[PDB]
Design an enzyme around this catalytic site. Sequence first.
Site, PDB file in Angstrom:
ATOM      1  N   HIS A  46       0.813  -1.192   0.000  1.00 54.06           N
ATOM      2  CA  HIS A  46       0.000   0.000   0.000  1.00 54.06           C
ATOM      3  C   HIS A  46       0.869   1.274   0.000  1.00 54.06           C
ATOM      4  O   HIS A  46       2.023   1.278   0.418  1.00 54.06           O
ATOM      5  CB  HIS A  46      -0.828   0.125   1.333  1.00 54.06           C
ATOM      6  N   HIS A  48       1.044   4.606   1.987  1.00 51.14           N
ATOM      7  CA  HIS A  48       0.694   5.196   3.263  1.00 51.14           C
ATOM      8  C   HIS A  48       0.881   6.700   3.214  1.00 51.14           C
ATOM      9  O   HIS A  48       1.573   7.255   2.390  1.00 51.14           O
ATOM     10  CB  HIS A  48       1.538   4.603   4.380  1.00 51.14           C
ATOM     11  N   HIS A  63      -3.150   4.413   5.842  1.00 48.03           N
ATOM     12  CA  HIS A  63      -3.131   4.387   4.398  1.00 48.03           C
ATOM     13  C   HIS A  63      -3.383   5.790   3.856  1.00 48.03           C
ATOM     14  O   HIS A  63      -4.119   6.578   4.428  1.00 48.03           O
ATOM     15  CB  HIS A  63      -4.186   3.426   3.871  1.00 48.03           C
ATOM     16  N   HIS A  71     -11.246   1.122   3.636  1.00 46.46           N
ATOM     17  CA  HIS A  71     -10.254   0.242   3.022  1.00 46.46           C
ATOM     18  C   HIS A  71     -10.923  -0.791   2.112  1.00 46.46           C
ATOM     19  O   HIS A  71     -11.957  -1.336   2.468  1.00 46.46           O
ATOM     20  CB  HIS A  71      -9.435  -0.484   4.096  1.00 46.46           C
ATOM     21  N   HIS A  80      -9.257   3.068  -0.216  1.00 51.41           N
ATOM     22  CA  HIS A  80      -8.242   4.096  -0.061  1.00 51.41           C
ATOM     23  C   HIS A  80      -7.559   4.372  -1.381  1.00 51.41           C
ATOM     24  O   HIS A  80      -7.275   3.471  -2.160  1.00 51.41           O
ATOM     25  CB  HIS A  80      -7.213   3.609   0.969  1.00 51.41           C
ATOM     26  N   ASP A  83      -4.659   1.846  -1.700  1.00 48.45           N
ATOM     27  CA  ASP A  83      -4.948   0.410  -1.604  1.00 48.45           C
ATOM     28  C   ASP A  83      -4.584  -0.360  -2.841  1.00 48.45           C
ATOM     29  O   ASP A  83      -5.402  -0.555  -3.751  1.00 48.45           O
ATOM     30  CB  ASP A  83      -6.439   0.230  -1.287  1.00 48.45           C
ATOM     31  N   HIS A 120       3.880  -5.370   3.786  1.00 47.81           N
ATOM     32  CA  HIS A 120       3.480  -5.885   5.087  1.00 47.81           C
ATOM     33  C   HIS A 120       3.847  -7.332   5.340  1.00 47.81           C
ATOM     34  O   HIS A 120       4.074  -8.124   4.435  1.00 47.81           O
ATOM     35  CB  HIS A 120       1.954  -5.731   5.221  1.00 47.81           C
TER      36      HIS A 120
HETATM   37 CU    CU Z   1       0.052  -0.701   3.950  1.00 45.61          CU
HETATM   38 ZN    ZN Z   2      -6.360   0.973   2.825  1.00 46.21          ZN
END
Ligand code: CU
Ligand code: ZN
Length: 153
Positions: A46, A48, A63, A71, A80, A83, A120
């Site tokens: 993602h 951020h 995000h 999300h 987002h 996303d 992540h």
């Molecule tokens: Cu992320």
């Molecule tokens: Zn998100």
Amino acid sequence: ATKAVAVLKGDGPVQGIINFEQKESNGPVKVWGSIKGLTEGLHGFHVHEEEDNTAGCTSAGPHFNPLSRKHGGPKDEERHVGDLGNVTADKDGVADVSIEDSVISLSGDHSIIGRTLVVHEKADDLGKGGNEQSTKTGNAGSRLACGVIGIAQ
Ligand SMILES: [Cu+2]
Ligand SMILES: [Zn+2]
Ligand SMILES: [Cl-]
Ligand SMILES: [Cl-]
């Protein structure tokens, strides 16, 4: 065309060079590269919010969400801006990124240039999980590597 690069690094073995290209100021953004050092399987990926010069992935933030939405996955209508879903790492830890996205942009009021790209520890549940945190972060867990999205030099 506008071009950007994010160099992902973290405190562990996760690293990679991610490229971005946007041919038109309101056209799709293409995103590609490889990330190494990952556990096998899906990892959330993602943009951020963080744009200060903080030390690595200590304050990536929420995000990137300039439209104040919930999300989702990249194909979901409700998502987002940041996303970008999941990347998939193989057994030797390499995930290839190949994304075309209509929501992110390198230009204008909501440019992702200067924001923080994050990969992540866990999969993104695409906002379909059973808690409110699914609709915030997709339950993707800790940040393993991050980098500023910078204009190509
Ligand atoms: Cu992320
Ligand atoms: Zn998100
Ligand atoms: Cl985690
Ligand atoms: Cl944790």
